[PDB]
Structures are given as C-alpha cells and as structure tokens.
Amino acid sequence: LKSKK
Amino acid sequence: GLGGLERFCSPGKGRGLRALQPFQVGDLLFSCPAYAYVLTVNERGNHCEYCFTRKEGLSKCGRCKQAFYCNVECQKEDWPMHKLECSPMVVFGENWNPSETVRLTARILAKQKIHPERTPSEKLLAVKEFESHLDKLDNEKKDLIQSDIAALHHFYSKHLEFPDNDSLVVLFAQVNCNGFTIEDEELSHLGSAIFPDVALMNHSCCPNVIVTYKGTLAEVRAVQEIKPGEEVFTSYIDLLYPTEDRNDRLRDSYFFTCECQECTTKDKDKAKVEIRKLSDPPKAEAIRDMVRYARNVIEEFRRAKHYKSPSELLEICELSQEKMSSVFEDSNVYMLHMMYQAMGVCLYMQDWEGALQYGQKIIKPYSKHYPLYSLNVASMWLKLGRLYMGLEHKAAGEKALKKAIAIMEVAHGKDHPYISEIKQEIESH
Ligand SMILES: Nc1ncnc2c1ncn2[C@@H]1O[C@H](CSCC[C@H](N)C(=O)O)[C@@H](O)[C@H]1O
Ligand SMILES: [Zn+2]
Ligand SMILES: [Zn+2]
Ligand SMILES: [Zn+2]
C-alpha cells in the first residue's frame, strides 16, 4: 500500500 | 467536489487532481475521512480500533478480548465493522489469520451494503471507479488474489453477500492499487485504509504534497508551492532509492513508469549510489556487481527477519556493510538501508546505545537524499531525539526533536497532536 517506509 | 481543486484527465496518467487556486508550503489542500480502515493486529491494545487514538487504559471488547476502545461510544460506533471479526476470532481461535488486505476488503464489502450511495470520502473519485490494472495481471498475481478471495470466503461468509469471483478479483486489484498504509510519527505501520479522494492523486518522485493522518483522517499538505492549473502529486513510495529502483517498485505495485523531473533527469542517482574515491578507481562492472549484491541482500534480510535471531540479523547488516564498503561510500543508499535495518534490530532488542550509534551515521545522508520536507527525515530525527533523551543527552535530544518538529509543522500542520506530544517531551525534560 501507498506509504513512506 | 473539493474547494480550490478539481478532477481532470492527466495526459498519460489517467485521472488526476488539479489546483484551481494557489497553495503555499504547509497549506492543507483537503482532508479525507477513511472510507474503510483496519487497525493492524500488532497495534491492538495500543490504539483505539474505532478512532486510532493512541492511549493507555483502552477498554477491551468483552466477547473476543481482541479489540480495544477509548470508551463505550468508540466500541458501539466500531460494531458494524468489528462484528465481521468478533465471533470469528473466538470460533476460529488460533486458526484466525486473514491477511490485512482481506481484513480491509471485508470492510469495503460491508460498507457497500450499509452505505451503497457516494460517501463524503468520494467527493471526486469513487471506490467503484478505482483503477484495477486487471488486464496487466500475470498468473502469479492472479494466484495471489485467488488466495485472498479464498481467505475472504473462509473467514467472512457470516455477514457478507459476495459478488461473483470476477468482481472480487477487480476489488482485490483495486485495493492493492489504491490502498493506503496508515503510519505513526515514527513511520511505524498502524493499519490500512481506503481514502478515495486521496487515491485520485497521481505519483511523482518530486511531490508537491504529503499525506499525513490525524487518527483515521487523511490530510493533504503542500510541500512545494502549487499554482492554479498545476497537477497535485504525492509520492507512492520511499524516495531514498535511485531511479531504476523507484521504477521497479512503481512498475511492480502500480503498473506504470514514472517520468517526473527526477526520473527523467536522474540528477540524484550519482550521489545515491556514491562510490569510494580509491587510488585505483572501481571498474563499471565492479559497481554493477555491488548494486546487484546490494539489492539481493535487501531481499535476503527482508525474508530473514521472519525467522532469524536478532544477532543473525545484525550479522547480515554488519557483513553486508563490510563487503559493500570496499566499493560504496557510507552515504550510499545501499549502505544506509543496512544501517537503518541494523538500527531497527537494536531498537527491538532495546539496545538504545546501539540504535543511537546507527542513527547518528544515517541522518546527514538521509537529509541529502530525501526531498526538502520528508516524513522519512522527520521520523529519523524523532527516533534520534527520543534515543538522546532516553540516554540523558538532553541538549542533543532537544536539537533533534526540534529538527523533527520543523519538518512536521509543514507536513502534519503546526497544531498536530504529534507535535504537542514532542513539545511535551522537550518540556518534561
Ligand atoms: N506519474 C504517473 N505516471 C503514469 N501513471 C500514473 C502516475 N501516477 C499514477 N499513475 C496511474 O494511477 C494509478 C494509481 S491511482 C491514481 C489515480 C489514477 N490516475 C486514476 O485514473 O484512477 C497507477 O497505478 C497508474 O496507472
Ligand atoms: Zn476511540
Ligand atoms: Zn469483539
Ligand atoms: Zn519519478
């Protein structure tokens, strides 16, 4: 899923 | 729709979000309440199931004993979703193991039955309109979706009236393409959710917005000035990596190749894969071999964390950094990846000194590789500050916590509860 880490 | 913004046809990028008014750095473009959301299993007891408030003394659901709430209101409000799992968890017991994607998808199906009409989360893009990339799916991806469909029928047949298998493959593909992970201030995974209006935004490796969370509410803030007519872009991935790595991830998970300024120019690729300035400079093929080795160890470690001991995991980090250091500089992203993984192992073992030792080496190169306002940078400064504070290094702790705050004021908003908690950490010590 669309994330930073 | 949403004031000051609009949905449009972005050439070569399907549908997108366009500004109709200027936005300055730190301005809130819009907020999006979660359409469907699920708190991750490992965070139960730490956060309220309904509103995601992180608090002590959360009330336990009396039946399953595996859902925690702020009070009876959060419990009651969560019941329409919680009922999908409550009795199943006690009945299946140890056998209850649906994947987070399956858990989220069951909640989407439940929401569609209760509220078939357009929700306040779908002012510009509806869940039904989500891009699926069904046509792009190979046999391996269809088999993974089929495993998910079987788990959905296995654990959630009590309350759900399922569409045909074809509609379920489209749904699981839409969820993989449009789903969001919700992360805390340290970028720790809290859960998964559907934010339809947020999913309208296309990707860029030089984004002009950052998505943050206030409980289950997604907030979208400018990290660059946005002018009327300009498309609003967020980053779908970790921006530490060079162009090829970024595009390999974008192609695999999102079925597209980025053509943003960063991907076109490849300006940052050289510093990201920094090579040691040796008397006998390393050969092109020797660099390529190390980049290949680096990507392989990243995957090896990813698998190893599921079964290896903390000392075995630290060994992989130390040994791989040693091999890489003969060709790569310490500021090189592959070196930084292993140091970050090693810091993570130290944090788990509660080896605060060891975690601090690693964080100190990571911070300066992180600031240089990531964009001006970056959640990855803010999060590293925050970890460092908390380590310094915990180890009685108050001046260094205060400096690092204030570096975290400065970035977070732009991304999360000046008034964000996370910033009030960090300021309380500075004030209490
Ligand atoms: N920078 C980019 N270049 C090309 N396609 C992009 C892109 N960013 C996002 N996309 C597309 O958008 C999908 C994610 S959902 C974003 C909204 C989408 N454009 C839509 O019409 O529904 C991707 O899997 C890809 O097909
Ligand atoms: Zn609550
Ligand atoms: Zn329960
Ligand atoms: Zn790009």
Side-chain angles (χ1 to χ4, degrees):
Chain A
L1 303 197
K2 292 176 193 161
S3 59
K4 257 77 197 209
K5 187 177 159 174
Chain B
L2 273 323
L5 299 147
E6 71 170 2
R7 178 169 146 176
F8 84 115
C9 288
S10 183
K13 303 179 192 58
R15 300 151 307 184
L17 184 71
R18 175 156 72 181
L20 302 170
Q21 155 222 302
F23 292 100
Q24 299 314 130
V25 170
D27 289 353
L28 180 61
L29 272 69
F30 72 102
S31 258
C32 186
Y35 170 86
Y37 60 93
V38 74
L39 183 77
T40 205
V41 171
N42 299 157
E43 285 301 331
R44 304 170 157 172
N46 299 331
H47 294 256
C48 169
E49 223 58 47
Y50 182 67
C51 73
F52 277 35
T53 296
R54 183 172 63 210
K55 87 167 241 244
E56 291 294 283
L58 290 164
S59 306
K60 191 197 255 62
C61 172
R63 183 177 305 100
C64 63
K65 296 156 193 291
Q66 293 179 86
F68 299 78
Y69 301 99
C70 293
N71 46 60
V72 65
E73 261 43 63
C74 278
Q75 187 170 184
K76 280 158 78 212
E77 294 306 328
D78 194 52
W79 184 249
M81 293 303 183
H82 184 51
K83 79 158 165 182
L84 303 172
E85 299 181 337
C86 192
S87 184
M89 280 190 285
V90 16
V91 160
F92 288 97
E94 274 167 53
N95 302 314
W96 192 85
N97 66 354
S99 77
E100 193 153 310
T101 300
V102 170
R103 299 186 65 207
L104 183 59
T105 305
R107 291 183 190 218
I108 295 162
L109 291 164
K111 189 74 181 171
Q112 294 179 322
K113 173 76 187 164
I114 298 154
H115 196 301
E117 316 93 338
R118 174 172 223 93
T119 64
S121 299
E122 298 163 292
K123 291 163 141 75
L124 288 176
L125 181 68
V127 170
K128 242 92 156 77
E129 288 178 303
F130 281 167
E131 183 159 45
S132 73
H133 290 120
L134 170 82
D135 283 1
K136 298 180 197 61
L137 261 36
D138 66 344
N139 285 331
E140 197 160 301
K141 284 180 154 89
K142 291 184 280 210
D143 289 353
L144 290 156
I145 288 169
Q146 285 302 325
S147 294
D148 275 1
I149 288 164
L152 180 63
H153 283 107
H154 186 80
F155 296 112
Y156 299 93
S157 279
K158 201 68 170 182
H159 301 289
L160 267 23
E161 286 136 43
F162 295 116
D164 61 4
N165 188 273
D166 281 358
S167 306
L168 286 178
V169 31
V170 166
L171 185 55
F172 273 104
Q174 285 174 320
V175 171
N176 289 348
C177 182
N178 300 275
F180 289 81
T181 119
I182 293 171
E183 285 148 326
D184 68 15
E185 74 291 3
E186 287 194 17
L187 294 185
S188 187
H189 178 82
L190 293 192
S192 293
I194 302 302
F195 294 107
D197 290 335
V198 184
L200 178 56
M201 298 181 290
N202 284 321
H203 171 272
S204 179
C205 299
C206 37
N208 49 202
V209 300
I210 287 180
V211 180
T212 67
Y213 312 96
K214 192 172 275 168
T216 65
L217 181 74
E219 297 188 316
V220 181
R221 287 187 182 80
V223 292
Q224 290 190 44
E225 191 175 316
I226 311 168
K227 289 151 140 187
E230 297 186 334
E231 186 168 2
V232 179
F233 298 111
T234 196
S235 176
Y236 289 7
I237 53 156
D238 192 332
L239 298 175
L240 181 66
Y241 309 98
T243 308
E244 198 198 348
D245 290 341
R246 286 201 316 278
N247 278 301
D248 280 341
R249 229 289 258 183
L250 296 164
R251 278 189 293 262
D252 189 52
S253 301
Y254 304 103
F255 310 90
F256 79 91
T257 297
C258 190
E259 291 177 18
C260 81
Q261 214 59 62
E262 293 290 4
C263 294
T264 300
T265 200
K266 299 175 184 265
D267 278 352
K268 292 189 183 184
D269 284 9
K270 238 100 116 75
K272 283 171 175 3
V273 200
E274 203 79 86
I275 304 306
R276 273 234 263 155
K277 300 284 183 290
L278 305 169
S279 307
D280 182 4
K283 205 247 215 73
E285 255 295 298
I287 311 300
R288 310 223 286 265
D289 286 324
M290 200 91 296
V291 173
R292 208 237 183 174
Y293 166 85
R295 295 167 205 226
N296 296 326
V297 286
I298 288 161
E299 228 302 276
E300 187 195 312
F301 190 89
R302 222 256 316 126
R303 292 195 306 270
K305 49 162 66 168
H306 299 290
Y307 64 96
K308 306 265 231 289
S309 70
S311 287
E312 284 168 298
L313 290 181
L314 282 178
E315 218 85 283
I316 298 154
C317 297
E318 292 158 345
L319 260 59
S320 67
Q321 274 169 256
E322 192 202 316
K323 194 183 174 171
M324 288 190 292
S325 66
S326 65
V327 183
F328 298 167
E329 213 68 77
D330 276 1
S331 70
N332 181 295
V333 304
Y334 303 113
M335 284 296 289
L336 257 23
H337 179 105
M338 296 311 145
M339 290 176 201
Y340 179 87
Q341 292 304 312
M343 184 185 182
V345 179
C346 293
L347 286 173
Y348 184 69
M349 301 178 303
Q350 299 181 210
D351 175 5
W352 317 124
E353 288 89 336
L356 183 61
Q357 208 162 122
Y358 281 113
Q360 291 182 322
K361 291 192 81 169
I362 296 160
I363 201 49
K364 290 186 177 261
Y366 251 33
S367 296
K368 93 112 115 183
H369 300 316
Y370 281 110
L372 185 59
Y373 300 99
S374 172
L375 297 189
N376 301 82
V377 177
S379 174
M380 187 53 66
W381 276 126
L382 184 46
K383 284 175 172 165
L384 236 18
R386 287 175 168 167
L387 286 164
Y388 281 131
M389 292 303 289
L391 292 157
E392 317 295 342
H393 300 62
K394 285 166 203 351
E398 196 179 306
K399 256 185 272 288
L401 293 180
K402 289 181 172 178
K403 289 259 185 143
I405 288 163
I407 295 156
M408 293 174 74
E409 282 182 333
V410 169
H412 295 80
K414 292 181 178 180
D415 61 332
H416 197 103
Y418 286 149
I419 295 167
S420 305
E421 292 164 34
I422 307 159
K423 281 173 174 173
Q424 249 293 111
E425 285 165 64
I426 293 163
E427 103 121 58
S428 295
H429 262 3

